[PDB]
Design a protein around this ligand. Structure first.
Ligand code: F0G
Ligand code: F0G
Lengths: 511, 511
């Protein structure tokens, strides 16, 4: 009961899951904690900043580059001056996306500080595009109203009174303007997939499924409809329910009050590999439903590659690998080199509203230091003719094979292997009906994955963090330097874990 | 017409204002650009990352600490493990606020990546406190409805039908539950001051006055009522207009439908020195209106010290200097040492809802690198018995005196000096009726301050950026190492500028 100033509830909970440890140094795929005697104990990191460390902890090339930038007196804070590195970074991502998609499209870049901040840049730019669409529609409706009032007052046409349910000339027009203004000021919707994770700020959290993370904040910001990824014959009907009309007058002899489409949906968000769903890759059938939706509503499709980008899936863009044709793209995690904080929103130049370049800004965005490190990260992942993607793919295959080898012999406690390249997960079978009270209680609290992670830490010196809404998945997203030995030690560790879980050995698994 | 991938509109605009320059190196209060010959031209930086650089660009102590942290293999990405540096940082801020306010209050710290992110942590925690208050109110209304239905059905009391406008027993209760649920799901309000700047993300931008920055995004998120800072006899009426009622039944013989207060305001936000208002310090009368409002509505008062904190005003907290008694505090800018990105929300432990420690999170938040640099920044500003605050105050006084000396002789084009410590500004008199076409056109576009900044750049090698919604203020927020010579050069530069503006020399001022 001494004074505590941060992290008491968080540390209490980590301690009870068996994850109460302090890492004092990190290098490559290894984090070190101190044992009772003050010796460094090495632990294999499969979490790696939730997929921030494609090149591992404190990669010597990234550290040396950072130290060189600082020794050179890089201008970190040069707001409202020419910062050509922003353009140079966007040029490279532009060239990479052209190469990987064969599409000769150009993208404007807006930088931020976090993946949620890049996603929110896209939500704002989306809303700018919806205000454009709205101004134009309302401009046409005024024209239609002028032309219907000219026809009606002169006597060239008569108002059809069978259409009057939908609301005297001047009065019916006022009632239309009142209905339309009501509709105009209603919040927009965003469309996401079930299990979607797009960040936890006031805007982005509404785009994040995890119910305890989101539902307390529901009232603050525009909501998302979470479209059922696996049951996509239903998406069509869910978005059709969300159609909203404005009113105008239609001239033919006869004038009629008629409904016209109002743009409600600001954007569609998608993860090429679904972090909050336990690393499920978007299927071709779903990609094609999202394309239909985007073409149908004429809002942008935002591809969140905060986690899937910068080579993780064995291409630079996972959207490119899985055929998702986005309008806007977002990057963060690995672009900071595992040491700094950087993010980018790529908005197709044919859609990009130039106001955004001067009405949106951030103190720290586009800083000199994270700009230099981004150019280094892009140089490293592009080096030697794209062989780094090849290494991700071959390490990814080796590690997926091990995970499948383990599932095949422990299918009683493992349902699936999910993901691609080095963004993988094991789905754990429900343990809410477990023999051991200790396990069953943890499973019923949504903690099972954390307990099991605890086991792997204390018994095998392997750092794993769960994913998914009830910690029903074990994440494996290590560096492209993961060795065959480290993969064998992980296999050993998982056979041990899934053998104890089979045996319902609650005393060994739960403290 | 070559391909461009970022910043084309932004660079076009900076070029036309005469601010089209690239700074290649920075040290202390100096930024260097390259002249036509490729020689370094030194420029005095009065912008300093909008007040991020209390210790200047690339302070040797901060650079050396950062290089040591990187060479030690700092664990940057240790998510969901014990990170004691978070607690150690919060301990120090806690001790500093106690010392400066004499209040023995304790604060929980939640870290983020940007000032907007810290402000949005506070908006979310505010909304968590409003959901608590709402659950409790609705719990009591159910009880009052049970007790009114028991009284009415048994016959112990009769329903008074003069109260029925506000909506048969069971039917009037359903109509109350329908009204109440409607109200429950409505967006909350935030209260801010006129000219308020709190960030530009989906949540925070609604809290930011600047109309072109905000009005396009109005539909996305809960709004702010911008309270008139100078006319605070009107605030009372503005907040009273925003009162909203729920309905219940009140038992006496007689049952009556009655209105009860619904909690609508999530939070009050304030800057101790108002960045978006041209560096106006909050007056005691306004501080006391904000205290009244907070005590009256029982929502938290959030003190945004993103810009005013870490010694800028001549104390660590500007709230402490000006007697603002906040519930939550936010810090960012200087805490990154001018090289990394870090922010913190301090929430009073008596109000702090422990769910927030586990339902809110961020990939980059609380990273090892910015944590080590924060501890260094806090060591430096606290060093040698608080003499750093003394130096801010004496440098601040010297620079304010020069700005007042300049206003006194150029009161035709300068209306006021605003701010405190090293967070100062000159208010420029309106130039929309200027003789020179060139000046008048720029003033009418809101660009006057940028034009003048251009002059100071090209004619005197001084970097100044404007503040305020029509760039009607010139900001001066340099490092505590600003020399007497640099202050003299700034005086010379401003006499020159304000003499040309007096002379309406549009050919010298506008390119
Ligand atoms: C796909 C995706 N989008 C957005 C964000 C938010 O980025 P941020 O603001 O944290 O820098 C994250 C973070 N994903 C990690 C936290 C995870 O699911 O473990 C992410 O995985
Ligand atoms: C008082 C205040 N609050 C919040 C923010 C947002 O912080 P961020 O997300 O940019 O890191 C800033 C930035 N203020 C600068 C931009 C200014 O007043 O010009 C700020 O000054």
């Amino acid at each position: 009961g001494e004074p505590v100033y941060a992290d008491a509830v968080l540390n209490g909970w980590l301690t009870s899951m068996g994850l109460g440890v302090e890492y004092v140094r990190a290098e490559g795929n290894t984090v070190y904690y101190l044992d009772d005697e003050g010796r460094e104990v090495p632990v294999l990191d499969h979490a790696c900043g939730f997929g921030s460390l494609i090149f591992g902890h404190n990669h010597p090339e990234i550290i040396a580059h950072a130290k060189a930038a600082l020794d050179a007196g890089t201008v970190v804070h040069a707001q409202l001056s020419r910062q050509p590195r922003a353009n140079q970074i966007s040029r490279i991502l532009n060239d990479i996306m052209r190469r990987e998609t064969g599409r000769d499209d150009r993208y404007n870049a807006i930088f931020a500080n976090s993946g949620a901040e890049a996603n929110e840049i896209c939500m704002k730019h989306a809303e700018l595009e919806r205000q454009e669409r709205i101004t134009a529609l309302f401009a046409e409706i005024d024209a239609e109203l002028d032309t219907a009032r000219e026809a009606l007052t002169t006597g060239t046409a008569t108002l059809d009174t069978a259409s009057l349910p939908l609301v005297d000339v001047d009065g019916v027009i006022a009632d239309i303007h009142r209905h339309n203004d009501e509709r105009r000021a209603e919040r927009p919707l965003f469309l996401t997939l079930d299990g979607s994770f797009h960040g936890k700020l006031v805007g982005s959290i509404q785009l994040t499924q995890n119910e305890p993370w989101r539902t307390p904040f529901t009232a603050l910001s525009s909501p998302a409809r979470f479209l059922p990824a696996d049951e996509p014959e239903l998406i069509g009907k869910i978005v059709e329910d969300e159609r909203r009309s404005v009113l105008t007058l239609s001239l033919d002899d006869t004038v009629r009050v008629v409904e016209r489409d109002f743009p409600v949906v600001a954007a569609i968000f998608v993860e090429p590999v679904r972090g909050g769903s336990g690393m499920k890759t978007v299927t071709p059938e779903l990609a094609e439903e999202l394309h239909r939706l985007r073409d149908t509503l004429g809002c942008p499709l935002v591809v969140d590659e905060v986690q899937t980008g910068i080579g993780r899936t064995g291409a630079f863009f996972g959207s490119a690998l899985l055929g998702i044709r986005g309008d806007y793209y977002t990057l963060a995690k690995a672009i900071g080199g595992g040491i700094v904080k950087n993010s980018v929103a790529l908005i197709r130049q044919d859609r990009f509203l130039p106001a955004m370049e001067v009405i949106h800004s951030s103190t720290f965005a586009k800083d000199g230091l994270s700009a230099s490190i981004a150019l280094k990260v892009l140089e490293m992942v592009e080096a030697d003719g794209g062989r780094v993607y090849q290494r991700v793919r071959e390490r990814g295959q080796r590690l997926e094979a091990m995970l499948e080898s383990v599932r095949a012999d422990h299918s009683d406690v493992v349902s699936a292997v999910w993901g691609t390249g080095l963004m993988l997960a094991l789905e754990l079978r429900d343990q809410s009906n477990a023999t051991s009270q200790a396990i069953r209680e943890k499973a019923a609290h949504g903690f099972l994955g954390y307990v099991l992670a605890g086991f792997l830490l204390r018994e095998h010196h392997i750092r794993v963090l769960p994913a998914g809404p009830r910690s029903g998945f074990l994440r494996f997203s290590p560096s492209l330097y993961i060795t065959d030995e480290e993969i064998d030690r992980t296999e050993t560790a998982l056979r041990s874990l899934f053998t104890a879980l089979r045996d319902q050995d609650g005393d060994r698994l739960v403290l």
